[PDB]
């Protein structure tokens, strides 16, 4: 029910766009897509063609006039890595959300004359500190008709959907995890041991096949080395795995008759 009515109500609806309904699931509008991280390879044919689509997407969806997307073009200082590009643009669009800074194309010294008919796109040349970006849009184009587009929403629209008991239990777990990876990353910088390649899988050889056939087999800590965490025989096809708390410790009213 939560995905018929809350989460993916819009999927094969001909009245709701995908790009509109992907924002409508967090009660956002089309006007809340702040930044559009362009592919933007400094190619004559690419940069004109990409601005046509993002303008025509916003024009068809009824984005209000005077609301352009801030087109950021990351490839002025990194270049085009021809396949790691959509991951750099997705890493960059995440940092626009959590900071609010919309960076500027510092190699844009004179934006093209044709690009002023696209009134739904703004091309900044220096970084502007927005009060907050709610959604970005990473689009990229490949050789061989390989257009793609990802939409990325600020994570505070997930934490709205939780309750105060789930969020506070989450918040103390992520701050206890931050102290564990602060200690690791400060050690691993000065000792050059970020990558610790494993030598063994978390099971032995005659635990390898019993683990694969049990969907409820989870790793616990070893006893002779608590820093190493492995599959033991008691985790595999265990007797406390399917049976739980709410229906079996409270099976004193259903097993009493």
């Amino acid at each position: 029910a939560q995905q018929e009515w809350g989460n993916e109500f819009w999927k094969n609806d001909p009245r709701i766009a995908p790009l509109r309904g992907a924002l409508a699931t967090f009660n956002l509008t089309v006007d809340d897509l702040g930044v559009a991280s362009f592919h933007g390879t400094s190619t004559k044919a690419n940069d004109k063609n990409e601005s046509i689509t993002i303008n025509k997407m916003m024009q068809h969806l009824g984005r209000s006039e005077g609301n352009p997307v801030f087109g950021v073009f990351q490839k002025y200082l990194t270049g085009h890595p021809k396949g790691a590009a959509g991951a750099w643009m997705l890493n960059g669009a995440i940092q626009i959300l959590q900071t609010g800074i919309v960076p500027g194309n510092r190699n844009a010294d004179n934006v093209d004359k044709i690009l002023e008919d696209f009134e739904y796109v703004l091309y900044p040349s220096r970084s502007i500190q927005t009060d907050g970006i709610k959604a970005c849009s990473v689009t990229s184009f490949g050789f061989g008709q390989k257009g793609g587009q990802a939409i990325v929403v600020h994570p505070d629209y997930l934490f709205a959907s939780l309750d105060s008991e789930t969020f506070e239990e989450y918040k103390t777990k992520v701050e206890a995890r931050y102290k564990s990876t602060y200690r690791y990353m400060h050690n691993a910088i000065i000792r050059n041991t970020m990558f610790v390649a494993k030598s063994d899988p978390p099971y032995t050889d005659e635990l390898e096949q019993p683990v694969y056939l049990d969907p409820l087999a989870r790793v616990n800590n070893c006893k002779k080395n608590p820093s190493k965490l492995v599959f033991v025989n008691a985790d595999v096809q265990s007797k406390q795995n399917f049976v739980g708390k709410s229906a079996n410790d409270t099976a004193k009213v259903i097993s009493s008759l």
Partner: protein, 482 residues
Amino acid sequence: YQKARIEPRANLKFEFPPLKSHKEIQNKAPGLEGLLDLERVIVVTGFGEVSPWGNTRTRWEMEAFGEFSIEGCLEMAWIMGFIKYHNGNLKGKPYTGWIDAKTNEPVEDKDIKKKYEEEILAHAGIRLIEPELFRGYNPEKKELIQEVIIEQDMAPFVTDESTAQQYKLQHEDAVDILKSEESDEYTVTFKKGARLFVPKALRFDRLVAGQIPTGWDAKRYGISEDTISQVDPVTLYALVSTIEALLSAGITDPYEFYKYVHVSEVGNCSGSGMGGVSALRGMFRDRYSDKPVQNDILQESFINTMSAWVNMLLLSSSGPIKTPVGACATAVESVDIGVETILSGKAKICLVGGYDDFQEEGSYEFANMNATSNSLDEFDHGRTPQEMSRPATTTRNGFMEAQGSGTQVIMNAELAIKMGVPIYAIVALTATATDKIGRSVPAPGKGILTTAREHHGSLKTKSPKLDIKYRTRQLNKRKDQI
């Protein structure tokens, strides 16, 4: 009158997202409470990269601020091998800080941006092609071989027994081999009409590329030499943005995944565009030219074996693997595969991203397609290498090739709240779309325009499920039937 001063050493903190309060969040986004199924919400949990501008922390403060801070210049000088750490004793006095690498001087953290700021900005980004980073590839002397038929017989020379039988096997009447009556060597004379290959060199136009900073070594991240000498150079870029995407999530041990998730539920949908092109050169040219290439150079050329070395060295998962190819958009395609593996239920954590490499042969072929900027034509316009990539500018001419990788870690929202990992983003949708009929492969089109498609022909009302009041009313009466 000489008061005690303070020297500001760098305070590197590897910060998580800044979680604001719950009352602030629900005032900003009211209405959503129990309406979203968290298992159908894909979140980005960690991310990392290797770039011409270092990693994902030093690239951002160059992209946003235009210069490095004292903690992003220490992080950059550590990457490029300028400073080392040394705890203990040197020159008698006990010292426990950072130490220069060329000399052994105790550099202070305040003096990083006055000592190495020249060398960091000169050896990162979109500088000229440095030949020591590409096994001696000098684009100003681009090597070919020319087939020549000799019109006069050649001076005889000595060789091995097996090699002389290989010259006779190729061209038979254009060689006469002859065994030495004393030793077990042969005399080879190439008579006229034989074909040779004389090397020549030409001046190639494309001299600028965006390289990984000079001094980047994957042993600094902990990768052993037995992995360095075996795998392709792209696999090292994929292995250190996977360990950086996992450490951006607080996953310091990848086997912590298996306290919440079965081993068949950790995927890997990273992909490349061309794969290990440094191994494709080793089997198509370097073995044709009899250079000593390793025997399993075919297995390092596959696009899917960079994500195999991730599972072979880090993850040990038996979960899905779906490696895509998009060749310029293969990390947005890889996100599309990664969110569909998790929404189907086949995986719960999915490594996702893209990786590629700059090499000589692909650089020459992009120039033949007229896709890359003519770097000598940009010198006629007075452009620096640092300003040869100008998107949306009226005088733009071709792209600028780079190398590196980028990796995200996507998972369920319900699993991410349970593990207590940081959530950086929400992947709202991902789409992929081809174009119309043409006869030109590297030509873009308006194909992704179908991600905003809507029918509003004569419809006079809104869609009734476009307001959250109605959808919370139908869901709450369905929650009562359950």
